[PDB]
Design a protein around this ligand. Structure first.
Ligand code: FME
Ligand code: MG
Ligand code: MG
Ligand code: MG
Ligand code: MG
Ligand code: MG
Ligand code: MG
Ligand code: MG
Ligand code: MG
Ligand code: MG
Ligand code: MG
Ligand code: MG
Ligand code: MG
Ligand code: MG
Ligand code: MG
Ligand code: MG
Ligand code: MG
Ligand code: MG
Ligand code: MG
Ligand code: MG
Ligand code: MG
Ligand code: MG
Ligand code: MG
Ligand code: MG
Ligand code: MG
Ligand code: MG
Ligand code: MG
Ligand code: MG
Ligand code: MG
Ligand code: MG
Ligand code: MG
Ligand code: MG
Ligand code: MG
Ligand code: MG
Ligand code: MG
Ligand code: MG
Ligand code: MG
Ligand code: MG
Ligand code: MG
Ligand code: MG
Ligand code: MG
Ligand code: MG
Ligand code: MG
Ligand code: MG
Ligand code: MG
Ligand code: MG
Ligand code: MG
Ligand code: MG
Ligand code: MG
Ligand code: MG
Ligand code: MG
Ligand code: MG
Ligand code: MG
Ligand code: MG
Ligand code: MG
Ligand code: MG
Ligand code: MG
Ligand code: MG
Ligand code: MG
Ligand code: MG
Ligand code: MG
Ligand code: MG
Ligand code: MG
Ligand code: MG
Ligand code: MG
Ligand code: MG
Ligand code: MG
Ligand code: MG
Ligand code: MG
Ligand code: MG
Ligand code: MG
Ligand code: MG
Ligand code: MG
Ligand code: MG
Lengths: 114, 118, 56, 123, 209
RNA sequence: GAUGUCGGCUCAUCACAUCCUGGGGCUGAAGUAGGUCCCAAGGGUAUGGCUGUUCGCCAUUUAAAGUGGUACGCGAGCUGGGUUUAGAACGUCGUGAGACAGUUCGGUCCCUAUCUGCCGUGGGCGCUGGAGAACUGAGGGGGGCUGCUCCUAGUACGAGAGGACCGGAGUGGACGCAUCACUGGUGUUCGGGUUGUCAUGCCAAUGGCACUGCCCGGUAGCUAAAUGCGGAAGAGAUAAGUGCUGAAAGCAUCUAAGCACGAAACUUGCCCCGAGAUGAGUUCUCCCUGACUCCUUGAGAGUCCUGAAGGAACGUUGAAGACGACGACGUUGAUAGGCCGGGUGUGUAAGCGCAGCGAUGCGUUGAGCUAACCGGUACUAAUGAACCGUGAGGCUUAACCU
RNA sequence: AAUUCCUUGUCGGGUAAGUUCCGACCUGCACGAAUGGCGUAAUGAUGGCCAGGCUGUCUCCACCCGAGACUCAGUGAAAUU
RNA sequence: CACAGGUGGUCAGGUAGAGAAUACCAAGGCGCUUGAGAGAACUCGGGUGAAGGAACUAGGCAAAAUGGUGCCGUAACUUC
RNA sequence: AGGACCGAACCGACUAAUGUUGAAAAAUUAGCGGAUGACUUGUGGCUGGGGGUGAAAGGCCAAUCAAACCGGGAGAUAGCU
């Protein structure tokens, strides 16, 4: 509906860069621990992107301490302070859900030259 | 519940529905007017009209699309050579439905479906 | 799953009271031919709303 | 969502390797336990000279779940396996002196400041 | 006090500056025109009748058109009544806007919920099904027993069975009001309100409190 | 001339001789925690191991894991493990056929609901002229559970160890209502990958079939594991209990008059239905104010003219729906389909060119296709009509204006 | 124990918890030597128990595809009374 | 019964395949003598499923799962 | 070589669901066992009712079996309904 459309567009971010599944990104997200508010970096492969305007989200998977971690960021959430693409990956899919069974040599995403 | 769902099941499976509507669209193209059950015509609209929209702008890719659907060279040739140029100026609604009583065998509400320039 | 006592013709008629058909309210008259046809249906001879839509 | 008969891995150097939930404490007919919910477990596979032996019945706190927790913004954090850190039945303090793998913000509480302080990373 | 009649535009979220996503429902609470004032002396109870929106000229029937023209207001799409507290007093023709919820923190939203059709017992009353296997026969979702035996030899009133579910008036209470934008005629409540998009909602101030 | 007999599952409903929470008395009640008795049935009242078992034991919880009635509730609702068919064997009994509330393995559980009942849902007529809408509200139903932490407060109490009543927040468990913004599920109507094979003359490209062939994602919708909300506060009359004043009985005494307090029970307060509430209510609004016979002169029958508000019917239909019903729209038109733009989804179409001997890669290209979504657009289909509904609405009395 | 009543004998193993199972003891109600005793590799749509994998069997169901059920037209039963 | 049952022999093509299995097809035969619409509960036959994984139950009943060829490797026990 | 192995035809019938006035007076769907043999099958023949035949269940002997079916004794008898 139009009214909802303006209500979303009033809050949507404008600085969000272009990234694709297979890209390695790092997302610095505000952490409010104690009284002090800082930034924490989460870096990993982007395995899913859901585009719905304000309701857009994306899933980042990393391998921390031998423990795979997935995190679904709401792209326009104020907590998601910033995103930066540390590497362009080239894949023939839109959701890389097969990387869950893969680790190490079998979880390598080829670079995208152009 | 079927809220906001679209498309009629017509007491058939999906493969049979697909093949039946392919055949019905072929017949409607070929004869420019056919007599069907009223819901079958109301569902054949949604299949036939996109074929004409596809035929409006001619290309080898569009020919292969309209042949992947329908699957007849005679039908695709007729589409692109007449029904495209004939409907080039009309923005949809290429078909007209005229309820024509009931069927003798099973009291099925029947309707004619026609091309609007026939 | 079966009756214990036989229902009367009274109760049978009471049940069938809702089975009566309903006559068509009023036929429409085609404007050009004057034929009678069901509303929003083409006439027997192929006319509808003042046009010849189907040959024969 | 850890319920009875759920096999959790062990995220500390306390000796256990696989444990099985046997009870979700904290309420009647309670169904599941999330990150930060105390459960009663039994050790099903332990290392030889570890602190605790196979078969013991003792509590544990869930720290990583495949279902994962939801942040107020709507985000979720999903791990690749369910993990718990053993606690003593009475003291309810961690038994292991190390915690492996990440833990989450859901433990930033007085009861689990040990785990938060000894964790590798807190997400 | 009195409420307003709105339309459920849809449901969105609000990202507060502290990174919290409030799931809000958007209600298009436009102006409500008071078509009638009912008092004790003539009606035995104090209430106002309001209308909202606008209806088709040729589909506003002559009695309804006359009733609106008595008040001198443009024919809205419906008529709703709101009972009055003793202090407040309204007059005919007054256009009440969503600014009425400027200082109201919690509201009650009542509307017709979605119609689930003919809902079985498992859906309607959360009856538990029976073993999908282990020998079960044609009774994987049936209600099971529905009574005792020869005593009482009858099924009690109010028994839970299958039937029509939804499509009935439902009131969700004590919803937090997030934003009251009068310039766009909007009300934003924290949470989900009954009914599907486009339905009519009656939003009153909180009554529990 | 048959009332199916244990246990399990689903579903319950009542009693109070109450398990928890709620209010009290006494205590060999310091405090916490008790013991016991009185009032109280609103709500709640475990998951597993063993066994066919209800039961019991045990593990671990919980505020609690109540006792009973209901054909030891519930097989025209499910099961068939037990016991009671026919097979077989063990121990024992008998010479034997065979037998054993001794065991051990195996063993066809039928019914399309007429009536009552219950859950939904309509049709008819009534409600005293007809119609549209809003509603009052008799009456009925739903809901009523509770913990843990923190403050009060290491305060009262206590030798200390220990550790409050009262009051106030925060946060959960179970349960219920709603919803789909989010996390996801499904998504055989969307996109792609690929195997076998057949076909479209062949290459290329596609289509059929193989459970959607097998998969990979996924739009709308519906959904839960997802997210919001609820249990109340207060008021009235009380129970057990506590009293004030107070005699009968110079005192005494909660009572005999009179006054007060008092619980999750009761009546309300919250939510839903609800004027067939035949006691058929109220308030707005709208519509119809023409003649004429006959008489069985009756609240009579009939003819002509007239059909109103409105309704119904038909059509396009819906986040409404089994069918009815309900809602929207019918060209004074966005009701549905199509079309246009977008979103979304999958993921760089075909054709052509280049590199490679070739599979293949690269360029046009993030292209192509894109269901149910969104914003628009009368292009197609919602036709003039016709049909039902009438023509001022009984009598008596009262009060008014005359 | 296909035998064992009392009895869920007692001890040990397996389980958080094991009336079933395995190994023992012997107090054999009421084993026992061709109406065979004790073992026994292989075999079994054989009985009991345990573990790995796997799963809607279940926590707790949700959605979808078809055939009925539902409406319309034609035909048109039955038990029972 | 124009009944999802029973009935002996003979012929037996193409591709993939060990195959008279199986998948698609030729030659040939057939769409099964009621259909049409809607897309409720519930039943039947199927598909998929978050986290868990026998906690279900009399019992893993049912379903899920394994599944081919070549090579490597293979325990207790044994009548070898 | 083999009463060998895996597995179609062929023979059976272990589990489940359906059905239980069924499509069928014992079947269908999904699995399941044997599948060169104590196999299976066509055709013809033989054995008959206190008798046959039986790798044994009181099984089978024309949808009938602790003694077939048909006719007769026979209108058996019925202290029973
Ligand atoms: C026993 O009393 C009897 C069962 C014996 S039949 C195997 N029950 C009758 O109701
Ligand atoms: Mg639609
Ligand atoms: Mg049909
Ligand atoms: Mg197919
Ligand atoms: Mg009788
Ligand atoms: Mg009828
Ligand atoms: Mg609906
Ligand atoms: Mg259950
Ligand atoms: Mg079943
Ligand atoms: Mg009888
Ligand atoms: Mg009592
Ligand atoms: Mg009561
Ligand atoms: Mg009460
Ligand atoms: Mg028990
Ligand atoms: Mg077990
Ligand atoms: Mg058992
Ligand atoms: Mg009983
Ligand atoms: Mg009972
Ligand atoms: Mg029973
Ligand atoms: Mg039954
Ligand atoms: Mg019964
Ligand atoms: Mg009965
Ligand atoms: Mg049995
Ligand atoms: Mg026997
Ligand atoms: Mg009766
Ligand atoms: Mg959702
Ligand atoms: Mg949406
Ligand atoms: Mg998804
Ligand atoms: Mg979805
Ligand atoms: Mg899919
Ligand atoms: Mg090719
Ligand atoms: Mg074919
Ligand atoms: Mg005195
Ligand atoms: Mg896109
Ligand atoms: Mg392609
Ligand atoms: Mg014993
Ligand atoms: Mg033990
Ligand atoms: Mg023991
Ligand atoms: Mg033993
Ligand atoms: Mg012996
Ligand atoms: Mg002996
Ligand atoms: Mg002897
Ligand atoms: Mg022997
Ligand atoms: Mg054998
Ligand atoms: Mg197991
Ligand atoms: Mg019929
Ligand atoms: Mg036939
Ligand atoms: Mg044969
Ligand atoms: Mg062949
Ligand atoms: Mg074959
Ligand atoms: Mg052929
Ligand atoms: Mg269906
Ligand atoms: Mg099913
Ligand atoms: Mg499946
Ligand atoms: Mg699952
Ligand atoms: Mg998936
Ligand atoms: Mg999974
Ligand atoms: Mg159990
Ligand atoms: Mg069990
Ligand atoms: Mg099985
Ligand atoms: Mg052999
Ligand atoms: Mg045999
Ligand atoms: Mg078979
Ligand atoms: Mg076989
Ligand atoms: Mg064998
Ligand atoms: Mg074999
Ligand atoms: Mg022979
Ligand atoms: Mg003889
Ligand atoms: Mg015998
Ligand atoms: Mg016989
Ligand atoms: Mg004899
Ligand atoms: Mg004689
Ligand atoms: Mg005789
Ligand atoms: Mg006789």
């Amino acid at each position: 509906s139009n009214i909802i459309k303006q209500l979303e567009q009033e809050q949507m971010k404008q600085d969000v860069p272009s990234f694709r599944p297979g890209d390695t990104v790092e997302v610095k997200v505000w952490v409010v621990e104690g009284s002090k508010k800082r930034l924490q970096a989460f870096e990993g492969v982007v395995i899913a992107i859901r585009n719905r305007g304000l309701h857009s989200a994306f899933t980042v998977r990393k391998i921390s301490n031998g423990e795979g971690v997935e995190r679904v960021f709401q792209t326009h959430s104020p907590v998601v302070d910033s995103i930066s693409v540390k590497r362009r990956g080239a894949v023939r899919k839109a959701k890389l859900y097969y990387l869950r069974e893969r680790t190490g040599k079998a979880a390598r995403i080829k670079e995208r030259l152009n | 519940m079927r809220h906001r769902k679209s498309g009629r099941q017509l007491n058939r499976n999906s493969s049979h529905r697909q093949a039946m509507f392919r055949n019905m669209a072929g017949s409607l193209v070929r004869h420019e007017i056919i007599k069907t059950t009223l819901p079958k015509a109301k569902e054949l609209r949604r299949v036939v009209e996109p074929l004409i929209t596809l035929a409006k702008t001619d290309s080898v890719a569009n020919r292969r699309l309209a042949f992947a659907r329908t699957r007849d060279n005679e039908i695709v040739a007729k589409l692109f050579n007449e029904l495209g140029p004939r409907f080039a100026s009309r923005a949809g609604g290429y078909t007209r439905i005229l309820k024509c009583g009931f069927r003798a065998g099973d009291n099925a509400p029947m309707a004619y479906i026609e091309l609007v320039d026939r | 799953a079966v009756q214990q006592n036989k229902p009367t013709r009274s109760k049978r008629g009471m049940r069938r009271s809702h089975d009566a058909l309903t006559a068509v309210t009023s036929l429409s008259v085609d404007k050009t031919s004057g034929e009678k046809h069901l509303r929003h249906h083409i006439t027997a001879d192929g006319y509808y709303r003042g046009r010849k839509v189907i040959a024969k | 969502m850890i319920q009875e008969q759920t096999m959790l891995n062990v995220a500390d150097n306390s000796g256990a390797r696989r444990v099985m939930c046997i009870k979700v404490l904290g309420g009647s007919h309670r169904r599941y336990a999330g990150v930060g919910d105390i459960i009663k477990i039994t050790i099903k596979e332990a290392i030889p000279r570890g602190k605790v032996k196979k078969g013991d019945v003792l509590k544990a706190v869930v720290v990583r779940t495949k279902k994962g927790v939801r942040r107020p913004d709507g985000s979720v954090i999903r791990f690749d396996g369910n993990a718990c850190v053993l606690l003593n039945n009475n003291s309810e303090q961690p038994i292991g002196t190390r915690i492996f793998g990440p833990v989450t913000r859901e433990l930033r509480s007085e009861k689990f400041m040990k785990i938060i302080s000894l964790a590798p990373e807190v997400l | 006090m009195i409420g307003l009649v709105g339309k459920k535009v849809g449901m969105t979220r609000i990202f507060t500056e502290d990174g919290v996503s409030i799931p809000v429902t958007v209600i298009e609470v436009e102006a409500n025109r008071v078509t009638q004032v009912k008092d004790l002396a003539n009606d035995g109870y104090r209430a106002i009748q309001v209308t909202t929106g606008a209806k088709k000229a040729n589909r506003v029937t002559k009695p309804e058109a006359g009733h609106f023209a008595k008040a001198g207001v443009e024919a809205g799409r419906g008529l709703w009544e709101f009972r009055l507290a003793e202090g407040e007093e309204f007059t005919v023709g007054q256009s009440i806007s969503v600014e009425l919820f400027a200082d109201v923190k919690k509201v009650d939203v009542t509307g017709t919920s979605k119609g689930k059709g003919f809902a079985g017992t498992v859906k309607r009353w959360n009856f538990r099904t029976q073993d999908a296997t282990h020998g079960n026969s044609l009774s994987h979702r049936v209600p099971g027993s529905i009574g005792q035996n020869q005593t009482p030899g009858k099924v009690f009133k109010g028994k839970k069975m299958a039937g029509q579910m939804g499509n009935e008036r439902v009131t969700v209470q004590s919803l937090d009001v997030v934003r009251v934008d009068a310039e766009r005629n909007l009300l934003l409540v924290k949470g989900a309100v009954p009914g599907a998009t486009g339905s009519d909602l009656i939003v009153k101030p909180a009554v529990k409190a």
